[PDB]
Design a protein around this ligand. Structure first.
Ligand code: CA
Length: 492
């Protein structure tokens, strides 16, 4: 018997969980075993390990009619809410208020998370994966190059331009060639984020090309005239070779290639992984050193870091109408918002991956020193998976180098990070319009954006037509449904 036991008699629940198009709940997972030991509730996987399309597997199950007790996975928010409104998933509101003290208190102190997951009928149909942490990407620059060229780190957009041209013109790698590529980035979409430097937004959240809220108004950044003026500068920079010619194609290994080759000297990427190149390249590129910098003041006079971590993920789990043990299940869910539950779901298994020290879960050196990334070690154990749980940033702090952490603290202290838009949940009516036109509009914008950057089309010559096409393709109907849903969810 454990102090955390949910039931006096061992309870086995059937769960369908398929996530990341490759994994399913594995009851042989060390964490799954520990979870059962601590709650007296065991999860039995009815999902198909061999299936390679998680979203599809969800549908075949839903159609199947024969439902399990619990359904979990990533990117299921939308489906949880729709199949919840037509009665397949049990509303959790009352269940939480009476049997989940930890979940209850969490929502109480994190109202924004609660709003974000509320279906249009006001019900809560799933417990979400709550991530921890605020800073996402940041700006990094070659300090050794600034060193050679004898320049100080840029404080505003003017100096930034000066510095990047220096990088391309004054041969910092000194191989007597003009082979330097100032801005590189493994995520092509980051090139559009550059418009931030001219007071224009490129997205309302960490998701690329997302809507944002401006004075209670749902808007799309790519449709604003601000974006037009920003793109003009971006296209000029591309024309001058300040931006990687292959920005749209290099992708994934851009850092290894460009940094390893000693060609690039500036990027916008995640703190942890980007800073590791300082160590992994000490050998191959002597003196190589990237430093995080506060975002240079933009033309409007402010420091902008548009990217941030979402406060809630569209992942989690729900209770089906067929679950004959709703209160035991909810108490079980609640365990994952309690410290002991947060411990195993974030750190793994005591004695194996961590140990309690000073009342804190502390990873073993073997775990931190391994070339295998901590996240992957945990996934293989059933930890850091898309069930409904409260993530603990301290697990991440432990494998983030001191230099990266200092950079992150600087961003938090600087208050440059803009709050992201957590999205809205739409009714059938609304969703119908969105699903019919959004994708078309989005791809259209992306194609024009790409052409504008590459100079394939002049922005000023095509802006009026671009605006015309946006209205013609449904932008306005999409926004109206977004606005309607927004007013209902955030203004009621
Ligand atoms: Ca050179």
């Amino acid at each position: 018997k454990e102090a955390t036991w949910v039931t006096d008699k061992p309870l086995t629940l059937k769960i369908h969980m398929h996530f990341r198009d490759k994994w399913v709940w594995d009851e042989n997972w060390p964490v799954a075993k520990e979870s059962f030991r601590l709650t007296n509730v065991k999860l039995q996987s009815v999902a198909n390990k061999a299936a390679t399309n998680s979203q599809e597997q969800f549908n075949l199950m839903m159609a199947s009619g024969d439902l399990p007790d619990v359904v979990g996975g990533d990117n299921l928010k939308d489906k949880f809410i729709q199949y919840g409104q037509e009665g397949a998933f049990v509303p959790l509101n009352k269940l939480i208020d009476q049997y989940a003290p930890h979940i209850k208190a969490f929502f109480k102190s994190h109202p924004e998370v609660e709003r974000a997951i509320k279906a249009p009928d006001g019900n809560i149909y799933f417990i979400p994966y709550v991530p921890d942490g605020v800073v996402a990407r940041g700006y990094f620059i070659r300090e050794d190059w600034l060193k050679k060229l004898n320049l100080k780190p840029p404080q505003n957009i003017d100096e930034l331009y000066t510095v990047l041209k220096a990088f391309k013109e004054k041969d910092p790698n000194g191989n007597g060639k003009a082979d330097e590529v100032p801005f590189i980035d493994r995520h092509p979409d980051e090139v559009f984020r550059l418009v931030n430097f001219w007071g224009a937004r490129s997205s309302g959240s960490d998701n690329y090309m997302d809507f944002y809220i401006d004075n209670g108004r749902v808007k799309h950044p790519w449709a604003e005239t601000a974006f037009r003026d920003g793109m003009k500068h971006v296209a000029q920079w591309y024309k001058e070779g300040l931006i990687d010619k292959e920005i749209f194609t290099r992708k994934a290994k851009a850092r290894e290639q460009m940094f390893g080759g000693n060609l690039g000297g500036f990027t916008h990427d995640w703190f942890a992984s980007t800073m590791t190149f300082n160590e992994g390249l000490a050998k191959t590129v002597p003196g190589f050193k990237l430093i995080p910098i506060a975002p240079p003041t933009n033309s409007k006079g402010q420091r902008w870091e548009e990217d941030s971590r979402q406060k809630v993920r569209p992942d989690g789990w729900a209770i089906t109408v067929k679950n004959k043990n709703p209160v035991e299940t909810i108490k079980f869910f609640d365990f994952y918002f309690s410290r002991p539950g947060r411990d195993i779901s974030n750190f793994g298994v005591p004695g194996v991956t961590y140990d309690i020290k000073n009342g804190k879960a502390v990873f073993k050196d073997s775990v931190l020193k391994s070339p295998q990334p901590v996240n992957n070690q945990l996934y293989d154990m059933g930890a850091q998976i898309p069930i409904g749980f409260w993530q603990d940033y301290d697990y991440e702090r432990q494998w983030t180098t001191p230099e990266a952490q200092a950079g992150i603290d600087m961003y938090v202290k600087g208050k440059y990070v803009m709050p992201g838009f957590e999205g809205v949940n739409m009714t059938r009516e609304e969703r119908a319009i969105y699903d019919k036109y959004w994708a078309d509009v989005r791809t259209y914008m992306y194609e024009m954006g790409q052409a504008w950057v590459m100079g394939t089309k002049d922005v000023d010559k095509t802006w009026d037509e671009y605006q015309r096409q946006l209205k013609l393709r449904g932008l306005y109907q999409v926004l109206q449904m977004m606005q309607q849903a927004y007013d209902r969810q955030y203004k009621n």
